[PDB]
Design a protein around this ligand. Structure first.
Ligand code: FAR
Length: 139
């Protein structure tokens, strides 16, 4: 037969579509909700080993992620279009802050498919490969 080498190639540019599909409000809500439940216990455990500066940022991410989950669980399809937008904008703003605060620990993201991971510097666009404004589910 031929050489073994199928299944992988250049899914890189497609990954933003997959990432946007997965991290849509649909799945993003439960995924964030699960991590928010886990965040405090993780922090409490590593709190002794966690730098004061780092610990704080992680608390903000936990708090912000909670708000986002709260919004979706407190959302109704019966709300007006301006409400759908308003909650989204507020959530998006919160998302912008938390992504700027740092990514959650990989252990806490160990329920996500290894690859769609989130690097703070990459999120901060401090050192992006294209530098065009590559995002996750944002742009
Ligand atoms: C580019 C968009 C970002 C970083 C906002 C969405 C993601 C986060 C906030 C980080 C945690 C999210 C998941 C584990 C889905």
């Amino acid at each position: 037969g031929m050489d073994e080498g199928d299944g992988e190639g250049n899914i890189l540019p497609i990954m933003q579509s997959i990432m946007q599909n997965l991290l849509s409000k649909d799945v993003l809500y439960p995924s964030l909700k699960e991590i928010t439940e886990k965040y405090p216990e993780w922090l409490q455990s590593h709190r002794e080993s966690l730098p004061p500066e780092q610990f704080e940022k992680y608390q903000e991410q936990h708090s912000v992620m909670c708000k986002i989950c709260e919004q979706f669980e407190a959302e109704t399809p019966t709300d007006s279009e301006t409400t759908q937008k308003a909650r989204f904008e507020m959530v998006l703003d919160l998302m912008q802050q938390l992504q700027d605060l740092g990514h959650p620990p990989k252990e806490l993201a160990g329920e996500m498919p290894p690859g769609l991971n989130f690097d703070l510097d990459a999120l901060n666009l401090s050192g992006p490969p294209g530098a065009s404004g590559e995002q996750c589910l944002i742009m």
